[PDB]
Design a protein around this nucleic acid. Structure first.
Lengths: 61, 43, 247, 85, 72, 106
RNA sequence: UUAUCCAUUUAUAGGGAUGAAUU
RNA sequence: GAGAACUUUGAAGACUGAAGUGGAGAAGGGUUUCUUGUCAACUGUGAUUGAACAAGAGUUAGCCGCUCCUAAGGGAUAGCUGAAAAGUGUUUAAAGGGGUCCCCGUCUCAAAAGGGAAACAGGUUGAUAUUCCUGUGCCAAUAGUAUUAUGAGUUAGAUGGUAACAUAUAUAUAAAUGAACUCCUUUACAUAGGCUUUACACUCGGGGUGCGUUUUCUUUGCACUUUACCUUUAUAACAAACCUUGGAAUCAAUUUACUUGGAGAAGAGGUUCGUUGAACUCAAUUCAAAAAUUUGUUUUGUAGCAAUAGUAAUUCGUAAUUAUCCGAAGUGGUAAGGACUAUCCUUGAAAAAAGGAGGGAACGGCUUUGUGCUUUGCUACUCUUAAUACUUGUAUGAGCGUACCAACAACCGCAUCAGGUCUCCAAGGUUAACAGCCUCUGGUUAAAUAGAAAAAAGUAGGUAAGGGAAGUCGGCAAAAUAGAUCCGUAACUUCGGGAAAAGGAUUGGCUCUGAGGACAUUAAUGUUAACUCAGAACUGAAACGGACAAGGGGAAUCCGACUGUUUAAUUAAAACAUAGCAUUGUGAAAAGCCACAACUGGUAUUAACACAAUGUGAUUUCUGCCCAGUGCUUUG
RNA sequence: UCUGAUGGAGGAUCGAGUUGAUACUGACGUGCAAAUCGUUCAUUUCAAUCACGUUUAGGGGCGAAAGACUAAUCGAAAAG
């Protein structure tokens, strides 16, 4: 199973003939959206804190 | 069950005690006998 | 035959009201010298839902006058009354929404609820959600006044009987269509065991005068006399007429 | 984008019940789930809690109102006549 | 069980008439660290000594009225 | 994996029988019943949680120290600070208005 | 209104002009 | 052992596969439990076995439960009925408690899953373990007097902070006066959805120890590497709420989601609770800088419990010695908590018990006059914890359950019956998955029988050329794809659907490519993590959701609108219900409907937007004529 | 008005389990069984399922209605 996991890490057993659950069941779309939103908000907060953007610009973005 | 009342436990003990054979020294001169799986106490 | 469902209802076994979570009987203040010759103001502290009924109840705290302390009353809330409001009860209470006044003090045309059909019985008439009566006349000598009830009937009550000024809240409930059997199930779960109905014409003749036959019909006139016995009073009881009304 | 052409909030009912029944229930659910103006604080934040009880999210104050709206025309008219005098 | 850190409270508790036994635990760490545990009616009070000299001096100064229990 | 069983005569997943696994020094995974979380004490007027006072179940509150059952201010522990402030100003001003009404009557 | 009947309550003041408030 | 397919041991081949013949309980059973014998009968074959038979033994609690509280409700009292039997249960009740006159007040039972004082770990037996042993704790109770000692307060009730609020650390945070009368809080509560934190679970890599493989390969595969309750556990951290300051439109802060603000936002600084329970230099300690005691730097300790226990090893007479028990992470399975959002013509118990507050009734001590009050002369005095001594009747901890089964032969089905029977824990691989299939721990290899042979016939399955429903009442039965991704999807429609319509393509392995984050330095350079998609070569008997798992579709007609329910054991439907619609009665305790022998009661904790009695049966479009007959009903 | 996300409604869908019982009118029908076994099928956020407690008792109860159920007994239970 460790060897199989290493192969999967290289991306070796993930073809569409190996998938049985739907796209969302395999990788939750809500979770992906939450991750993206959190990283974008983190970046915006970092920029505003470091004063590289103005407050109004931060709110708009 | 494991949970019992005192009177019920005493009755169980008496029923067990009354389930023993007639002593041999007395036979030297019993029908009211039960098995736990065949005839239920019902009491 | 056997005892029919309507007859079984009065035995009160499974047909008792489901009242486990009811908050209390809705009654206004017991008559007192303060209400006879003045005003006593109670502060409404909360507006709660009584599971049996649709009209909200108001918990009103009065300060006892006979002894130090407070007393809590469960009134039927009128529309527009709000927590933190002081309501006045008595003969000299000002005519305002939520106040309890003798009906003889109110002018003609005022809308009232929590009507006392006899003085001092602390609230008997006009209590369902959205209902209101109208004060449509006072006697020349006072002592008596006539109101129009939500059924449209005119009733004559002595002028000392009390009522709340306004309309009991949660009006318009009937306007919502119960969409599904489940909503009716939940509605009657907290009232009674009157649901589902089951038509008598779908029964067997042993248990209903409508039951039996090869075609599911009444077979005899469904209008029964007022003197019919308990197992016989089953259709349109003592009907003066039938069919669609025309005005 | 626009999701349902006309059913709106009644899209939860799918095809069940009549179209007339769904339209009738939409008309009153629209105002049952609406926010109203709280005259005590001036913020439009009073929502229905139970069938006849309306609570303001800001004041935390609750009033007795209609089954589906904060006020009903009959009660409003009655208050108008009372306040005329 | 309660840990006490200052030395005055430990001495006072030991001198208090409710104490019966003192538990001496010694063990290598990396130097041998020790701990002295007064057994009272309510609690067992532990004091941890990294100082070998201090944990040589303290239980010696401890009055021999109350019994000793050496665990190792 | 180690599997567990109830130990406190209540073998149903009721809210008073909520349970937590723990690893013992003997290498066994055992189970301990957790205490029910108690609601916070609430103000008599606004029914909001009043701070400075612990939130113990009655049995633990009986054993609690007096310091963390009360707040050292007037109605402390029973009425929140904001409500007490409003009550004080109301009590003073509603008698002030009575006094000025009496003085203006004549 | 005294028989009789009904209602209410802690049988709790003779008739006219959103603080508490008890010793 | 007289006797062994079914007793025991070893070896092998397999099974159950954490949704278990695995561990714990409830109901029910009642000694079936354990040990030692033992085989007349039973253990549908055998039997040396056994739940059989016989003799002994075995169940240890202040902390687990009952016991207490109240619920649906039951019984009883007062009355009132009734020949009584019985029926109802405050309907003319003078019906225990508290303070010191007044206040409150039917009793009792009903939960081993609701509420609820308090326990953990290790070990121990043939059979009991949160019950025994060892150690460490916790809860409740503890009378009167007098001594000491602990603390506070006092020349009759303390103090800090602007505030949110905080403060008693005595062995032990025990004491921060407080009467009557009050007012609150806790107990104490639904459902759905996601987000988040923690613990447990699983997993990856490093170090150590032991074992295994070793024809060949293998810095390798496996196992152990642990840490309970308790210490307001101290702290740390975080979601929230609040306080001070501040004073917002170019609106801003902010969530996955929306939430919030001149009724005071952001920012800055704080307070508290709740999560958790050694986090954080946490505590003690070493070194420099601040002053008549603060900030920075090191060592120790699994924070105490705690290593003394446990585990895995190496030895030594056969009971002792020794060494390890520590360096980092990932997945999200389970559980709980948090802060939220949403739903209801549904709003989702009570009491015992506990706490907080408002109020301000009473007031030092030694001696003394007169009749508890004015009085004279002096002051160091009041509560709170603990211990001791003496009085007090003997001044700690009642009683009951605790074995075993829980079905697989211990229960109910007449039985050792393929049936029925409530709850908790829930590993790895594949995978969407607690599915199916295989596996580790644990359990098993047993089933009212075995051996041999192997035809007919039966039963449970497979496969069949060519044809493809010609079979048959009828495609009954079987077959046909069926996962996922991409594409495409009609009539009709209540505009929501129909829809997975129909119908196409692809799918393995291997080698790659690309995309999607977090962490620091003076715009630029390094360290490091998930599996998730997309694309390209190559490859093979053109095969790849390879096993497992897994829709047949379409054109229409009839019925019922739908979800739902039903003739337990021949009928699941078109029957019933349903929302919708319509009609009828009733304004009340001299009402409607209904119960009762009477008394009295149900609806009713109700009041026309209600209750009761009917018919029809979603929506759409409609619902025509007849009051002669029979009903019902209205006036006199 | 249109488009993309976000969001997570519904007596929504598939589907194990549960709760049932459509068909084979399969097996069995001197059964394992006085209703079972196999495959197939229905059902799973709600008029949902389960447990214990509690109420309703025989010309009575209870019935989403089949004269169904009321201890293998129901167009009037069982016992004497």
């Amino acid at each position: 199973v460790r060897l199989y996991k290493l192969a999967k890490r290289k991306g070796r057993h993930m073809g569409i003939g190996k998938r049985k659950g739907t796209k969302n069941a395999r990788t939750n779309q809500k979770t992906l959206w939450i991750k993206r939103q959190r990283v974008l908000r983190r970046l915006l907060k970092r920029l505003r804190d470091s004063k590289k953007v103005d407050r109004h610009l931060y709110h708009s973005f | 069950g494991s949970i019992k009342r005192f009177r019920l436990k005493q009755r169980l003990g008496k029923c067990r005690r009354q389930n023993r054979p007639v002593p041999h020294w007395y036979r030297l001169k019993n029908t009211k006998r039960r098995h736990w799986r065949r005839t239920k106490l019902g009491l | 035959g056997r005892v029919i469902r309507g007859q079984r209802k009065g035995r009160g076994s499974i047909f008792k009201s489901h009242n486990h979570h009811r908050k209390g009987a809705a009654k206004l203040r017991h008559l007192d010298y303060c209400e006879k010759k003045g005003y006593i103001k109670g502060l409404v502290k909360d507006i709660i839902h009584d599971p049996g009924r649709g009209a909200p109840l108001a918990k009103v705290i009065f300060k006892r006058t006979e002894k130090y302390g407070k007393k809590e009353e469960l009134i039927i809330a009128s529309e527009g009354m709000f927590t933190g409001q002081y309501i006045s009860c008595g003969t000299k209470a000002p005519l305002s929404v939520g106040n309890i006044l003798p009906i003889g003090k109110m002018p003609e045309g005022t809308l009232i609820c929590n009507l006392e059909h006899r003085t001092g019985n602390r609230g008997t008439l006009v209590k369902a959600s959205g209902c209101y009566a109208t004060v449509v006349g006072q006697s020349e000598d006072g002592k008596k006044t006539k109101v129009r009830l939500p059924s449209g009937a005119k009733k004559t009550i002595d002028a000392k009987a009390r009522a709340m000024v306004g309309v009991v809240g949660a009006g318009g409930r009937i306007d919502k269509p119960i969409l599904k059997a489940g909503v009716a199930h939940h509605k009657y779960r907290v009232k009674r065991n009157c649901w589902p109905k089951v038509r008598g014409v779908a029964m067997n003749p042993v248990e209903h005068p409508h039951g039996g036959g090869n075609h599911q019909h009444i077979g005899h006139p469904s209008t029964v006399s007022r003197s019919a016995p308990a197992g016989q009073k089953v259709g349109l009881i003592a009907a003066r007429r039938t069919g669609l009304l025309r005005g | 984008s626009r999701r349902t052409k006309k059913v709106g909030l009644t899209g939860k009912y799918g095809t069940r019940y009549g179209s007339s029944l769904r339209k009738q229930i939409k008309k009153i659910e629209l105002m049952q789930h609406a926010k109203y103006l709280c005259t005590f604080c001036g913020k439009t934040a009073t929502k229905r809690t139970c069938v006849g009880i309306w609570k303001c999210k800001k004041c935390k104050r609750k009033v007795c109102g209609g089954a589906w709206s904060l006020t009903t025309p009959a009660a409003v008219a009655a208050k108008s006549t009372i306040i005329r005098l | 069980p309660k840990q006490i850190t200052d030395i005055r409270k430990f001495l006072k508790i030991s001198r208090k008439p409710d104490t019966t036994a003192v538990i001496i635990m010694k063990k290598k760490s990396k130097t041998v660290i020790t701990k002295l545990k007064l057994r009272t009616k309510k609690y067992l009070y532990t004091m941890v000594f990294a100082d070998r000299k201090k944990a040589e001096r303290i239980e010696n100064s401890l009055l021999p009225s109350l019994k000793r229990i050496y665990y190792p | 994996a180690q599997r567990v069983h109830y130990r406190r005569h209540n073998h149903y997943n009721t809210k008073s029988n909520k349970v937590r696994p723990v690893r013992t020094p003997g290498g066994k995974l055992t189970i301990h019943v957790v205490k029910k979380k108690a609601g916070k004490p609430k103000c008599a007027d606004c029914k909001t949680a009043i701070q400075g006072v612990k939130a113990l179940r009655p049995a633990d509150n009986y054993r609690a120290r007096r310091k963390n059952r009360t707040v050292a201010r007037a109605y402390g522990g029973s009425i929140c600070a904001r409500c007490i402030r409003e009550r004080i100003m109301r009590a003073f001003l509603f008698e002030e208005q009575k006094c000025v009404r009496q003085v203006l009557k004549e």
